[PDB]
C-alpha cells in the first residue's frame, strides 16, 4: 500500500522531458563543433545515443528530486499529506516510500556505470574514428586549418559551389593550384599546380610547371603522429535527496505553490554547484589530492536529517 506508483508516473514523465532538455543542450553544444570546431556532422544522431549515459548521470537524481517534489506538492495542496497526518500515519511512511524510490533509481544509476556508462565512454572515445580517417563527402571549403600533425597545411578554395576554383592554395612552403575538380575513394583530380618552397633568398627557388599531378595531401592523421568519487557520490545523491526533499515539500498557503519549490531547488543546485567546483583537481582516478567533497556530502546529509527531525 503506497503512493510509490503515483510518484513513479511523474518520475517517468520528468525523466522523459529532461532527456530532451539535455539532448537540446548537448546538441546545441556539438553544433558548435559542427560549425566552428570543424568536425563533420555525419555523426550527430549517433553521437547523441553514444553519450546519453554521461548525460543521464545527472538526469536521474534530479529526476527523482523533481518527481518527488512536484508530486508531493499536489499531495500537500490537496490537503492529503495532512490527512495522512490526520490518520495515524507519520512522516516516516512517505520517508519509506521515498527511500524505496531511492533504491530503484540508485539501481538505475549503478547499472548505468556497470553496463552502459564506460561502454558508451569507450565507444565515444572513438568518434567513429576509423571513418574520421576514411574520407567521404566532407570537404568544408574556406577552412580546414588543423595545425596538429599536418605541418600547417591549409587548403581552402575561393569558389561558389565547386565548379570554378580560385586559389586552392594547398599549403604545406605552398603549392599553388589554378584549376581543380573532385573525386573520392584522397585522390583529387586537379589540373594544374605550381610548387614553391623558398623561405629565404639564399635558399633554393624551386618551380614546377603545370603537370599531371594529383596532390595527395589529405592523409589520415591519427594522434600518434574520480569514478571512485562519482560511483559513490551520485548513488549518495539518489539515496539522500529523497530523504532531503520531503521536509521541503510542505506547501504553505500564503506563499503559493511554485515558491514552495525555490528553497529545495536553491539547495539542490547549490549542492551540485559545490560538488562540481570541488571536482577542480581530479587527477583522473588514481591522483586524488583533496577530499573537501565529503565535507559537503556529510553536512548535507546532516542538513537532511536535521531538517526532517523536529524534537
Amino acid at each position: 500500500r503506497y503512493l510509490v506508483r503515483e510518484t513513479l508516473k511523474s518520475q517517468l514523465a520528468i525523466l522523459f522531458i529532461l532527456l530532451l532538455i539535455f539532448f537540446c543542450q548537448k546538441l546545441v553544444r556539438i553544433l558548435g563543433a559542427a560549425v566552428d570546431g570543424d568536425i563533420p556532422a555525419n555523426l550527430v544522431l549517433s553521437l547523441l545515443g553514444l553519450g546519453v549515459p554521461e548525460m543521464a548521470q545527472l538526469i536521474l537524481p534530479l529526476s527523482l528530486f523533481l518527481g518527488l517534489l512536484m508530486t508531493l506538492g499536489k499531495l500537500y495542496t490537496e490537503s492529503e499529506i495532512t490527512v495522512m497526518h490526520a490518520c495515524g500515519l507519520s512522516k516516516a511512511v512517505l520517508v519509506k516510500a521515498a527511500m524505496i524510490l531511492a533504491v530503484f533509481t540508485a539501481i538505475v544509476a549503478a547499472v548505468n556505470v556497470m553496463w552502459a556508462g564506460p561502454w558508451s565512454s569507450r565507444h565515444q572515445d572513438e568518434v567513429l574514428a576509423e571513418a574520421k580517417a576514411n574520407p567521404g563527402m566532407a570537404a568544408l571549403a574556406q577552412g580546414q586549418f588543423q595545425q596538429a600533425t599536418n605541418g600547417s597545411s591549409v587548403l581552402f578554395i575561393e569558389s561558389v559551389d565547386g565548379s570554378d576554383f580560385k586559389d586552392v592554395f594547398l599549403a604545406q612552403s605552398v603549392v599553388v593550384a589554378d584549376s581543380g575538380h573532385l573525386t573520392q575513394l584522397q585522390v583529387v583530380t586537379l589540373n594544374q599546380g605550381t610548387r614553391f618552397e623558398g623561405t629565404a633568398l639564399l635558399r633554393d627557388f624551386r618551380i614546377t610547371d603545370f603537370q599531371d599531378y594529383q596532390a595527395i595531401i589529405g592523409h589520415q592523421a591519427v594522434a600518434l603522429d574520480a569514478e571512485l568519487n562519482w560511483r559513490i557520490t551520485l548513488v549518495f545523491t539518489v539515496f539522500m535527496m529523497a530523504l532531503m526533499v520531503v521536509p521541503l515539500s510542505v506547501v504553505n498557503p500564503r506563499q503559493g505553490r511554485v515558491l514552495s519549490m525555490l528553497p529545495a531547488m536553491l539547495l539542490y543546485l547549490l549542492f551540485f554547484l559545490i560538488q562540481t567546483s570541488l571536482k577542480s583537481n581530479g587527477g583522473k582516478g588514481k591522483l586524488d589530492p583533496t577530499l573537501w567533497m565529503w565535507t559537503v556530502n556529510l553536512i548535507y546529509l546532516a542538513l537532511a536529517i536535521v531538517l526532517n527531525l523536529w524534537d
Binding site: 560549425v35 599553388v176 589554378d178 605550381t194 629565404a200
Partner: protein, 341 residues
C-alpha cells in the same frame, strides 16, 4: 492613469526577473571559471571579470527569456489577484492593455539596443582581455598562432603575435590573377602606428617573378588592421560597419550581424507573445502553470535560436531567414493564439 500602473508593474517584474537571471548565470559562470583559475587570482577570473561580464548576458542571452517571464508573471499577477478582469470589466480594452504594455516596452528595446553596441561588446572585449594571466586565451591579445589571413587575391601567413600589437610578422603571398609571386617578405618589425599604417612596410625580404630567370630581389633592413585582425571572437564582437568586413571576398558573421539587430524584435515579439498567452489558453490556470509555460517557451526560444542560427548549413539558407526564424515564427504562434477563438 493605470497606464502608469501596468507599465511600471511590467517594468519592475522585468527588472526583478532580469536581476535574478543575471545573478544565477553570473555565479554559475563564476564557479565555472573557478575550475580554471589556477593562474589568475581569487577574483581575476572571477568577480573583477563578471562585474563587467554580467551585461552581455543582460543584452541578448537571457533578456528575451527574462522578457517573457517578466511580462508574464507581472501580468499574471493581474489575473491571479482578479485585477486585469476588473479593468477589462470597466471597459479598458485588450488593445488598451497591449498598448499599455508596449508603451513601456520601448525602454526595453532602447535599453538592449544601447547596451549591445555600447557596453556589452567592449564588456566582453575587456573580459577576454583581462584573462591574459591564465594563458591559451584568445582575445585582443592573441597567442602564438599562425592566423591564416585572406585579403582577396593577397594572403598572409603569420609567424608570431605579441601583446604590444607588434609582429615578427607579415609574409605577403603577393598573388595576382596570373598567380605570379611578387614578394616573399618577412616583416620582422610590424609595430602598431596610426591609420596611415594599416599595413606598415617592414623588413623587405621579397622576390618578384618578372622573369623565370631574372629575379629582382631585395634583402634590406594587407587591408586587415589590428582592430580587424582580432577574428577569434566569433560571438558578438562589435558594430555593423566593422562586421561589414568579409565583403569583397563567410556566412556566420553576417548571421551574427542579423542576430545583433533582431534582439529588439525578439523582446517586442516576446512581450506580444506573453500578452497572447495572458489573453489565450491562460487566464484560468494558476501561477505554477504560468511560470512552467514561461520557462518552457523560453527554453523553446533558446533551442530554436541556438539551433536554427547554426542550422544554416544544409541549403545555406539566407541569414535573414535563419535569424528571424526564432522571432517571426514566434510572432506567428502568438498571432494564432490571439485569433484562435
Amino acid at each position: 492613469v493605470l497606464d502608469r500602473y501596468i507599465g511600471k508593474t511590467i517594468f519592475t517584474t522585468i527588472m526583478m526577473t532580469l536581476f535574478m537571471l543575471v545573478s544565477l548565470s553570473g555565479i554559475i559562470k563564476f564557479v565555472d571559471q573557478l575550475k580554471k583559475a589556477g593562474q589568475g587570482s581569487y577574483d581575476a577570473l572571477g568577480a573583477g571579470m563578471y562585474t563587467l561580464l554580467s551585461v552581455p548576458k543582460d543584452v541578448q542571452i537571457f533578456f528575451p527569456m527574462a522578457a517573457l517571464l517578466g511580462a508574464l508573471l507581472g501580468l499574471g499577477m493581474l489575473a491571479q489577484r482578479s485585477e486585469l478582469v476588473v479593468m477589462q470589466a470597466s471597459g479598458f480594452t485588450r488593445m488598451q492593455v497591449a498598448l499599455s504594455v508596449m508603451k513601456t516596452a520601448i525602454p526595453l528595446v532602447l535599453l538592449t539596443m544601447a547596451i549591445g553596441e555600447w557596453v556589452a561588446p567592449q564588456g566582453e572585449q575587456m573580459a577576454r582581455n583581462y584573462r591574459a594571466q591564465a594563458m591559451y586565451g584568445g582575445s585582443l591579445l592573441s597567442t602564438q598562432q599562425g592566423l591564416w589571413a585572406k585579403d582577396g587575391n593577397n594572403f598572409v601567413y603569420i609567424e608570431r603575435v605579441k601583446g604590444d600589437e607588434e609582429l615578427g610578422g607579415i609574409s605577403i603571398y603577393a598573388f595576382n590573377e596570373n598567380r605570379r609571386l611578387q614578394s616573399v617578405r618577412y616583416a620582422a618589425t610590424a609595430k602598431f602606428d596610426p591609420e596611415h599604417k594599416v599595413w606598415r612596410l617592414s623588413q623587405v625580404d621579397e622576390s618578384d617573378l618578372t622573369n623565370p630567370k631574372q629575379i629582382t630581389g631585395s634583402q634590406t633592413v594587407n587591408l586587415t588592421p589590428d582592430k580587424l585582425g582580432v577574428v577569434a571572437l566569433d560571438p558578438d564582437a562589435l558594430s555593423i560597419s566593422g562586421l561589414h568586413n568579409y565583403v569583397k571576398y563567410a556566412g556566420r558573421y553576417q548571421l551574427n550581424m542579423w542576430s545583433k539587430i533582431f534582439q529588439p524584435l525578439s523582446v517586442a515579439v516576446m512581450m506580444l507573445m506573453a500578452l497572447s498567452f495572458i489573453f489565450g489558453p491562460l487566464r484560468s490556470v494558476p501561477m505554477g502553470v504560468r511560470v512552467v509555460t514561461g520557462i518552457s517557451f523560453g527554453f523553446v526560444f533558446y533551442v530554436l535560436d541556438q539551433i536554427f542560427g547554426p542550422l544554416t548549413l544544409v541549403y545555406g539558407i539566407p541569414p535573414i531567414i535563419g535569424a528571424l526564424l526564432p522571432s517571426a515564427s514566434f510572432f506567428l504562434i502568438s498571432l494564432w493564439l490571439l485569433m484562435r477563438k
